Write an enzyme that holds these catalytic residues in place. Structure first.
Site, PDB file in Angstrom:
ATOM      1  N   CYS A   1      -6.075   1.754  -4.282  1.00  0.00           N
ATOM      2  CA  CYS A   1      -5.443   2.403  -3.150  1.00  0.00           C
ATOM      3  C   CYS A   1      -6.356   3.532  -2.666  1.00  0.00           C
ATOM      4  O   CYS A   1      -6.285   4.672  -3.192  1.00  0.00           O
ATOM      5  CB  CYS A   1      -4.058   2.923  -3.544  1.00  0.00           C
ATOM      6  SG  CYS A   1      -2.931   2.964  -2.114  1.00  0.00           S
TER       7      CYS A   1
ATOM      8  N   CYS B   1       0.826  -1.206   0.000  1.00  0.00           N
ATOM      9  CA  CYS B   1       0.000   0.000   0.000  1.00  0.00           C
ATOM     10  C   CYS B   1       0.862   1.258   0.000  1.00  0.00           C
ATOM     11  O   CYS B   1       1.093   1.859   1.053  1.00  0.00           O
ATOM     12  CB  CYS B   1      -0.953   0.013   1.200  1.00  0.00           C
ATOM     13  SG  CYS B   1      -2.300   1.221   1.068  1.00  0.00           S
TER      14      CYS B   1
HETATM   15  C1  LIG Z   1      -0.954   0.282   7.331  1.00  0.00           C
HETATM   16  C2  LIG Z   1      -1.401  -0.480   6.111  1.00  0.00           C
HETATM   17  C3  LIG Z   1      -2.508  -0.035   5.395  1.00  0.00           C
HETATM   18  C4  LIG Z   1      -2.946  -0.715   4.262  1.00  0.00           C
HETATM   19  N1  LIG Z   1      -4.055  -0.233   3.584  1.00  0.00           N
HETATM   20  C5  LIG Z   1      -4.455  -0.883   2.525  1.00  0.00           C
HETATM   21  C6  LIG Z   1      -5.616  -0.381   1.815  1.00  0.00           C
HETATM   22  O1  LIG Z   1      -6.273   0.614   2.116  1.00  0.00           O
HETATM   23  N2  LIG Z   1      -5.959  -1.130   0.717  1.00  0.00           N
HETATM   24  C7  LIG Z   1      -5.311  -2.267   0.269  1.00  0.00           C
HETATM   25  O2  LIG Z   1      -5.743  -2.837  -0.739  1.00  0.00           O
HETATM   26  N3  LIG Z   1      -4.219  -2.733   0.941  1.00  0.00           N
HETATM   27  C8  LIG Z   1      -3.823  -2.070   2.009  1.00  0.00           C
HETATM   28  N4  LIG Z   1      -2.733  -2.540   2.699  1.00  0.00           N
HETATM   29  C9  LIG Z   1      -2.042  -3.733   2.192  1.00  0.00           C
HETATM   30  C10 LIG Z   1      -2.650  -5.046   2.669  1.00  0.00           C
HETATM   31  O3  LIG Z   1      -2.711  -5.079   4.094  1.00  0.00           O
HETATM   32  C11 LIG Z   1      -1.770  -6.197   2.179  1.00  0.00           C
HETATM   33  O4  LIG Z   1      -1.297  -5.872   0.877  1.00  0.00           O
HETATM   34  C12 LIG Z   1      -2.456  -7.562   2.132  1.00  0.00           C
HETATM   35  O5  LIG Z   1      -2.629  -8.058   3.460  1.00  0.00           O
HETATM   36  C13 LIG Z   1      -1.684  -8.558   1.292  1.00  0.00           C
HETATM   37  O6  LIG Z   1      -2.043  -9.896   1.692  1.00  0.00           O
HETATM   38  P1  LIG Z   1      -0.948 -11.009   1.894  1.00  0.00           P
HETATM   39  O7  LIG Z   1      -1.591 -12.334   2.319  1.00  0.00           O
HETATM   40  O8  LIG Z   1      -0.066 -11.116   0.705  1.00  0.00           O
HETATM   41  O9  LIG Z   1      -0.129 -10.432   3.129  1.00  0.00           O
HETATM   42  P2  LIG Z   1      -0.458 -10.747   4.647  1.00  0.00           P
HETATM   43  O10 LIG Z   1      -1.897 -10.512   4.914  1.00  0.00           O
HETATM   44  O11 LIG Z   1       0.457  -9.880   5.519  1.00  0.00           O
HETATM   45  O12 LIG Z   1      -0.100 -12.292   4.762  1.00  0.00           O
HETATM   46  C14 LIG Z   1       1.204 -12.732   5.194  1.00  0.00           C
HETATM   47  C15 LIG Z   1       1.033 -13.811   6.237  1.00  0.00           C
HETATM   48  O13 LIG Z   1       2.129 -14.753   6.156  1.00  0.00           O
HETATM   49  C16 LIG Z   1       2.574 -15.048   7.461  1.00  0.00           C
HETATM   50  N5  LIG Z   1       3.977 -15.451   7.403  1.00  0.00           N
HETATM   51  C17 LIG Z   1       5.072 -14.634   7.294  1.00  0.00           C
HETATM   52  N6  LIG Z   1       6.217 -15.273   7.274  1.00  0.00           N
HETATM   53  C18 LIG Z   1       5.851 -16.606   7.383  1.00  0.00           C
HETATM   54  C19 LIG Z   1       6.600 -17.800   7.422  1.00  0.00           C
HETATM   55  N7  LIG Z   1       7.933 -17.842   7.351  1.00  0.00           N
HETATM   56  N8  LIG Z   1       5.923 -18.964   7.532  1.00  0.00           N
HETATM   57  C20 LIG Z   1       4.589 -18.928   7.604  1.00  0.00           C
HETATM   58  N9  LIG Z   1       3.776 -17.868   7.579  1.00  0.00           N
HETATM   59  C21 LIG Z   1       4.473 -16.730   7.466  1.00  0.00           C
HETATM   60  C22 LIG Z   1       2.315 -13.786   8.275  1.00  0.00           C
HETATM   61  O14 LIG Z   1       2.192 -14.107   9.656  1.00  0.00           O
HETATM   62  C23 LIG Z   1       0.983 -13.312   7.684  1.00  0.00           C
HETATM   63  O15 LIG Z   1      -0.135 -13.852   8.382  1.00  0.00           O
HETATM   64  C24 LIG Z   1      -2.258  -1.865   3.843  1.00  0.00           C
HETATM   65  C25 LIG Z   1      -1.152  -2.313   4.555  1.00  0.00           C
HETATM   66  C26 LIG Z   1      -0.717  -1.631   5.688  1.00  0.00           C
HETATM   67  C27 LIG Z   1       0.482  -2.139   6.440  1.00  0.00           C
END
Ligand SMILES: Cc1cc2nc3c(=O)[nH]c(=O)nc-3n(C[C@H](O)[C@H](O)[C@H](O)COP(=O)(O)OP(=O)(O)OC[C@H]3O[C@@H](n4cnc5c(N)ncnc54)[C@H](O)[C@@H]3O)c2cc1C
EC number: 1.8.5.8
Length: 413
Positions: free
Chosen positions: A339, A161
């Site tokens: 976004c 983000c």
């Molecule tokens: C402050 C903030 C605001 C945001 N606002 C927005 C918004 O308005 N709109 C939007 O679209 N996006 C937004 N985002 C982005 C959004 O939160 C992420 O892009 C989204 O969660 C991506 O999903 P993901 O599963 O790839 O990541 P995550 O949800 O972070 O999934 C990663 C997971 O993998 C786990 N993990 C890590 N390492 C390991 C390992 N070695 N073994 C096993 N598990 C592991 C972690 O514990 C976690 O649960 C924002 C992010 C932040 C930080």
């Protein structure tokens, strides 16, 4: 030697969503999620938590309450990936094989890459909306601001983000005018990039906002050291290497440098940079055909947002199924991501674009304008949609609504 048909690494946004979808294709008993964390967070909420408009409690739920029913949660941490033997290792000294692997480990936060951090977070006047251990400190620092510099940073790495580091800034400046301290405030945005946003339609909109409210943003300026006890910050000038300046802050919101997850950096599935080497369109791994990736952990050339994760899940859903029928994938992922740029306590510029960095709005009106309607959608509607729709496998982006909204404007126009 345990074994599952669909093994999903990571129990976050993409992991829970893909496990729900894969729960319907094969059995729920044929799916497993590997994830160590006990809390699951809707991180888009943390923007307004640090702004003082929402509670952090409402941004998280027990991981056990978002695991899809019947799917076996493996509460552990991924230690090694061995795609040449279709196998992974976990920190509980276990070795589990798969038939297809779905990598969804998100992005990694590197606060340690800044000299004074994370040590300096114990001191007042500093915080970060990107870590659950610091987002509440951002709101506290915002209230206890009395006079000085309000500095907001953007690192020299890929981020998740990219709009968040400036959302908190506009909300902070709005809070200053509201509470009678804008006359005592000096707002600064020291970003590593050379433009305020990646797509000009919204970068023009933000540029008007920056100039209207007398905000200072300094391009190619990266934070490298924090001196929390002295309330000082060190910034490197990326345009003139070697040039640094020390600036005293009354409130500092740091966005940490980010990298691929450590276990992925060297792994055989990795890019040259450490991201999961997937294909732009199918999200299937370029070398290992039974491996797939989604979300921040991969090298998809688009903004790493939760909206992108939703759009990718529907594509990835069909990609794995056509692979499970030994045909060839046809439906391509357009690079969609959104976004919701919060410019104030009741306004949001909802940016939406594709791989080509070209606008693609869902709604028939102009979204580059600050609009209260889009604020209500992001603040109150989307949290409902995240828990009850997306994580259940019933959401894959607004593409089917962009269709009828633009078919409705056919009857009209
Ligand atoms: C402050 C903030 C605001 C945001 N606002 C927005 C918004 O308005 N709109 C939007 O679209 N996006 C937004 N985002 C982005 C959004 O939160 C992420 O892009 C989204 O969660 C991506 O999903 P993901 O599963 O790839 O990541 P995550 O949800 O972070 O999934 C990663 C997971 O993998 C786990 N993990 C890590 N390492 C390991 C390992 N070695 N073994 C096993 N598990 C592991 C972690 O514990 C976690 O649960 C924002 C992010 C932040 C930080």
């Amino acid at each position: 030697m345990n074994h599952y048909e669909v093994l999903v690494l990571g129990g976050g946004s993409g992991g829970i969503t893909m496990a729900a979808r894969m729960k319907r294709k094969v059995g729920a008993e044929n799916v497993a999620i590997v994830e160590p964390s006990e809390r699951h967070f809707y991180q888009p909420i943390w923007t307004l938590v640090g702004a003082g408009a929402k509670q952090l409690s409402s941004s998280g739920r027990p991981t056990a309450s978002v695991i899809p029913s019947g799917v076996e949660w493996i509460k552990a941490r991924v230690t090694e990936l061995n795609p040449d033997k279709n196998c992974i290792h976990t920190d509980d000294d276990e070795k589990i094989s798969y038939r297809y692997l779905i990598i969804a480990l998100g992005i990694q936060l590197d606060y340690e890459k800044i000299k004074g951090l994370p040590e300096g977070f114990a001191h007042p006047k500093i915080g970060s909306n990107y870590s659950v251990k610091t987002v509440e400190k951002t709101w506290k620092a915002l209230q206890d601001f009395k006079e000085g510099n309000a500095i907001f940073t953007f690192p020299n790495t890929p981020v998740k983000c990219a709009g968040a580091p400036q959302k908190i800034m506009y909300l902070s400046e709005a809070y200053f005018r509201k509470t009678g301290k804008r006359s005592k405030a000096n707002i600064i945005f020291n970003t590593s990039l050379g433009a305020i946003f990646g797509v000009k339609k919204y970068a023009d909109a933000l540029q008007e906002i920056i100039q209207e409210r007398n905000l200072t943003v300094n391009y190619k300026k990266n934070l490298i050291e924090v001196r929390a006890d002295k309330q000082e910050a060190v910034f490197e000038n990326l345009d003139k290497p070697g040039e640094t300046q020390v600036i005293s802050y009354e409130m500092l919101h740091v966005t940490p440098p980010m990298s691929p997850p450590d276990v992925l950096k060297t792994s055989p599935v990795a890019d040259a940079a450490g991201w999961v080497d997937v294909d732009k369109e199918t999200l299937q791994h370029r070398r290992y055909p039974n491996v797939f990736g989604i979300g921040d952990c991969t090298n998809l050339p688009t903004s790493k947002t939760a909206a992108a994760v939703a759009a990718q899940s529907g594509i990835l859903d069909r990609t794995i199924s056509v692979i499970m029928k030994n045909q060839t994938p046809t439906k391509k992922y357009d690079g969609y991501t959104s976004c919701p740029l919060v410019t104030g306590y009741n306004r949001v510029i909802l940016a939406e674009f594709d791989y080509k960095a070209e606008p693609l709005e869902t709604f028939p009106f102009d979204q580059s304008k600050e609009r209260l309607s889009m604020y209500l959608m992001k603040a109150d509607l989307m949290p409902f949609l995240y828990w009850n729709m997306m994580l259940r496998g019933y959401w894959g982006g607004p593409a089917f609504l962009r269709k009828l909204f633009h078919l409705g404007m056919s009857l009209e126009h």
